[PDB]
Amino acid sequence: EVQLQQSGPVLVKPGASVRMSCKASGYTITDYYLNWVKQSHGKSLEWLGVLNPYSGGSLYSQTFKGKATLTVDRSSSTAYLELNSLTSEDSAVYYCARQLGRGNGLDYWGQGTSVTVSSVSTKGPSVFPLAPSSKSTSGGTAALGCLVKDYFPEPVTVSWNSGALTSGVHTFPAVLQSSGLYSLSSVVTVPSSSLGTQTYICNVNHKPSNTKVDKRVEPK
Amino acid sequence: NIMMTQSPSSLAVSAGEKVTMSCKSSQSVLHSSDQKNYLAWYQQKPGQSPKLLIYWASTRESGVPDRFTGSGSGTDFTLTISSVQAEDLAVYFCHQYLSSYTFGGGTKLEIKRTVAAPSVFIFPPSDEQLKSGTASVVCLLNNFYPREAKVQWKVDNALQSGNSQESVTEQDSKDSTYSLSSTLTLSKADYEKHKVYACEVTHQGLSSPVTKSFNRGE
């Protein structure tokens, strides 16, 4: 299957540069152009430019000329976007997206790389269980969760049971605390009858702080 | 640059209804050498990357359900979903690629469904967190509709203010509900001064507030 695998989220200081990667698999990278598109606040889309993996040549939006640099390593099937002179306004998710030719749409997009530009330092979260109890039951079901508290920047990713538990999960949008640190919760509803036979583990990743925490959540 | 304007900003329909949304370009997007309108539509589901639906204004991309149809010419384009399904909730973007690529601001398609009262759960602070000097108490409102809901925290029946934060999920792609989490944060010392920790929930599907509570250390 076609895949575009982008590098992980990063925190950088104003004025610094950052380079992120987009690795193509399931197809020959030189068969399609690669575009880069910025998304601000989960919505507004803005085009940066396009690279041709075969030649290595690029065409940039006037907005990003001299600010963005597109390159490719054909040997590793990997494209790169470097942004320089970073400002707060450069914080966004950056997508790479393939385009077969001039007339085509952007037919496959990577998962995006979140870049935060800030003077605030990284901080990894504390991860605390939200343990099912007699006050977290609703008609034969139990709710349980993990509280992921006090981190910077976004994003945190949470899975359950290494991705084997997805039904009934709600991983809430983070809240910005007065401290300037984020907190989020992730919960799941499960049968109360099987709390003793099943094991529930939240897998929390905060790439900017190297936090990889697995927390077992058991009845209180 | 060619400016793309989408309308409406958002709309909400029940499953099975037809929707149409508009995309206007500030100048023609017709490419002369192939006589194609260089106009594409994308669907972006919550937490996902955009997916190409339509290009050349009216050609559906392989694998896209046939309920999605693009139409229009000149500067006026339309995306129609003939029979909306619950999993179609998304932001839909148009895109011109005749000139320096530009996108519309999106139309957010939301789903209408029957009223559903929240299922409410409350969570005391973990012993681990308490050992570190802070108590976060969490109230969960699960799978409700419509999205408006109110949480009030009470500590031994005293209404709290200023010490909680909440957030609501995106709409669920299967059951069209929302969920909400609220966290009351106290120091350990303040937490230990009181017995009953209560979350009181108001919602359209409830005729009176629901309270979920626990007695600290029990």
Binding site: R102 | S99, S100
Partner: peptide
């Protein structure tokens, strides 16, 4: 302008 730069690039 830019439409022709795209034509040439592609």
């Amino acid at each position: 302008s830019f439409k022709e730069e795209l034509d040439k690039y592609f």
